[PDB]
Design an enzyme around this catalytic site. Structure first.
Site, PDB file in Angstrom:
ATOM      1  CG  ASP A 132      -9.107   4.639  14.124  1.00  0.00           C
ATOM      2  OD1 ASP A 132     -10.313   4.678  13.773  1.00  0.00           O
ATOM      3  OD2 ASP A 132      -8.160   4.787  13.323  1.00  0.00           O
ATOM      4  N   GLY A 144       0.800  -1.219   0.000  1.00  0.00           N
ATOM      5  CA  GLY A 144       0.000   0.000   0.000  1.00  0.00           C
ATOM      6  C   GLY A 144       0.830   1.264   0.000  1.00  0.00           C
ATOM      7  CB  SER A 145       1.607   3.959  -1.599  1.00  0.00           C
ATOM      8  OG  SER A 145       2.671   4.869  -1.372  1.00  0.00           O
ATOM      9  N   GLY A 201       2.772   7.113   4.141  1.00  0.00           N
ATOM     10  CA  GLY A 201       3.970   6.788   3.380  1.00  0.00           C
ATOM     11  C   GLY A 201       3.716   5.586   2.497  1.00  0.00           C
ATOM     12  CB  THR A 202       5.179   3.419   0.523  1.00  0.00           C
ATOM     13  OG1 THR A 202       5.166   2.168  -0.172  1.00  0.00           O
ATOM     14  CG2 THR A 202       6.616   3.930   0.693  1.00  0.00           C
TER      15      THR A 202
HETATM   16  C1  LIG Z   1      -0.100  -6.363   5.756  1.00  0.00           C
HETATM   17  N1  LIG Z   1       0.515  -6.022   7.044  1.00  0.00           N
HETATM   18  N2  LIG Z   1       1.167  -6.931   7.884  1.00  0.00           N
HETATM   19  C2  LIG Z   1       1.590  -6.294   8.944  1.00  0.00           C
HETATM   20  C3  LIG Z   1       1.263  -4.953   8.824  1.00  0.00           C
HETATM   21  C4  LIG Z   1       0.591  -4.789   7.645  1.00  0.00           C
HETATM   22  C5  LIG Z   1       0.062  -3.496   7.153  1.00  0.00           C
HETATM   23  N3  LIG Z   1       0.376  -2.385   7.807  1.00  0.00           N
HETATM   24  C6  LIG Z   1      -0.051  -1.181   7.419  1.00  0.00           C
HETATM   25  N4  LIG Z   1       0.336  -0.022   8.089  1.00  0.00           N
HETATM   26  C7  LIG Z   1       1.282   0.021   9.134  1.00  0.00           C
HETATM   27  N5  LIG Z   1       1.115   0.699  10.238  1.00  0.00           N
HETATM   28  N6  LIG Z   1       2.229   0.571  11.062  1.00  0.00           N
HETATM   29  C8  LIG Z   1       3.162  -0.233  10.462  1.00  0.00           C
HETATM   30  C9  LIG Z   1       4.441  -0.675  10.850  1.00  0.00           C
HETATM   31  C10 LIG Z   1       5.139  -1.507  10.018  1.00  0.00           C
HETATM   32  C11 LIG Z   1       4.594  -1.909   8.786  1.00  0.00           C
HETATM   33  C12 LIG Z   1       3.363  -1.462   8.368  1.00  0.00           C
HETATM   34  C13 LIG Z   1       2.611  -0.621   9.212  1.00  0.00           C
HETATM   35  C14 LIG Z   1      -0.904  -1.119   6.309  1.00  0.00           C
HETATM   36  C15 LIG Z   1      -1.248  -2.310   5.664  1.00  0.00           C
HETATM   37  N7  LIG Z   1      -0.759  -3.456   6.115  1.00  0.00           N
HETATM   38  C16 LIG Z   1      -2.153  -1.981   4.497  1.00  0.00           C
HETATM   39  C17 LIG Z   1      -1.395  -2.253   3.186  1.00  0.00           C
HETATM   40  C18 LIG Z   1      -3.441  -2.819   4.552  1.00  0.00           C
HETATM   41  O1  LIG Z   1      -2.497  -0.585   4.637  1.00  0.00           O
HETATM   42  C19 LIG Z   1      -1.581   0.014   5.580  1.00  0.00           C
END
Ligand SMILES: Cn1nccc1-c1nc(Nc2n[nH]c3ccccc23)c2c(n1)C(C)(C)OC2
Length: 299
Positions: A139, A23-24, A28-29
């Site tokens: 949330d 995602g982005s 960020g990304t």
């Molecule tokens: C798929 N998956 N598995 C663990 C975490 C995630 C994930 N985190 C997100 N946001 C995050 N929030 N905090 C983080 C810390 C490290 C990595 C990612 C994040 C976001 C998404 N997935 C999507 C693409 C579904 O949207 C956003």
């Protein structure tokens, strides 16, 4: 009060490979990747969140890391570590099925009553842990629930602690957030699941919700819901916060239901519906040698 003895793991950039973009947006990304600790002979599937550098952005990403590193429960998402590059990077265990909101929308034709009821238990367990830790989510929604396996979900985005349509009445009118306003959002999350990802109060502008709730109108009874399940959601939407159920009560109630799911959810073709399972074969891209899930990797 009690000292927070959580460990903040600092990870070397050279220990993790980015594979693809999940995602982005404004945050960020987010990337799908692998963490390979040196000489460990393990490859851990991870999600990597990377931010240009500004002092404001860096402060926000570190407050997120502090909260994420402070929790440890099977139904809550935890931080693996941080990477101290030009822009700070957060590393988390990969939840390969994405968020629950998109999972129910994409797989509605195979989601049976045992799954919806078990997800309800799991989210209540996660939430009950956050309560024992005196941490108010603020949330909770189906978008903020990640899917490890179709039979194992974990709550996320509690690290940011406005979604009017998921908020309790004390929250909208007075900005009062408690473990009992978290119960209202839990009720809305359940509604999202039970309707297979429908938008609550769809087409009703946000600036009207307060009046709707004050008149006593609530989200409708999903077609699959028996009055047993619907009464629980209705109880989460009481005006008196103390009248709402406790997460401990929600675990119990949905666990009772999960034992005979077809008595509580009426889904057409329920018994012939199936999703992927770790009890199945071929359940687990390039080199799949030495990969271990972060839940089984400890130091
Ligand atoms: C798929 N998956 N598995 C663990 C975490 C995630 C994930 N985190 C997100 N946001 C995050 N929030 N905090 C983080 C810390 C490290 C990595 C990612 C994040 C976001 C998404 N997935 C999507 C693409 C579904 O949207 C956003």
């Amino acid at each position: 009060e009690a000292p927070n003895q959580a460990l903040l793991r600092i990870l070397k950039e050279t220990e993790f490979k980015k594979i693809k973009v999940l995602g982005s947006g404004a945050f960020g990304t987010v990337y799908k990747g692998l963490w390979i600790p040196e000489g460990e002979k393990v490859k851990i599937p991870v999600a990597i969140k990377e931010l240009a550098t500004s002092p404001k952005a860096n402060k926000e990403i570190l407050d997120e890391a502090y909260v994420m590193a402070s929790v440890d429960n099977p139904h809550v998402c935890r931080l693996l570590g941080i990477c101290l590059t030009s822009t700070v990077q957060l590393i988390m265990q990969l939840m390969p099925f994405g968020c629950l909101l998109d999972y129910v929308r994409e797989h509605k034709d195979n989601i049976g009553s045992q799954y919806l009821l078990n997800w309800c238990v799991q989210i209540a367990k996660g939430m009950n842990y956050l309560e024992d830790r005196r941490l108010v989510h603020r949330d909770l929604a189906a978008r903020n629930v990640l899917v490890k396996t179709p039979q194992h979900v974990k709550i996320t985005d509690f690290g940011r602690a406005v979604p009017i349509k998921w908020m309790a009445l004390e929250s909208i009118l007075h900005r009062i957030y408690t473990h009992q306003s978290d119960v209202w959002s839990y009720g809305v999350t359940v509604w999202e699941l039970m309707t297979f990802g429908s938008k609550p109060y769809d087409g009703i502008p946000a600036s009207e919700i307060s009046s709707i709730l004050e008149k006593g109108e609530r989200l409708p009874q999903p077609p699959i819901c028996t009055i047993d399940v619907y009464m629980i959601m209705v109880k989460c939407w009481m005006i008196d916060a103390d009248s709402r159920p406790k997460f401990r009560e929600l675990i119990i109630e949905f666990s009772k239901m999960a034992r005979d799911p077809q008595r509580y959810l009426v889904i057409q073709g329920d018994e012939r519906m199936h999703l992927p399972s770790p009890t199945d074969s071929n359940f687990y891209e390039e080199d799949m040698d030495d990969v271990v899930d972060a839940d089984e990797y400890l130091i």
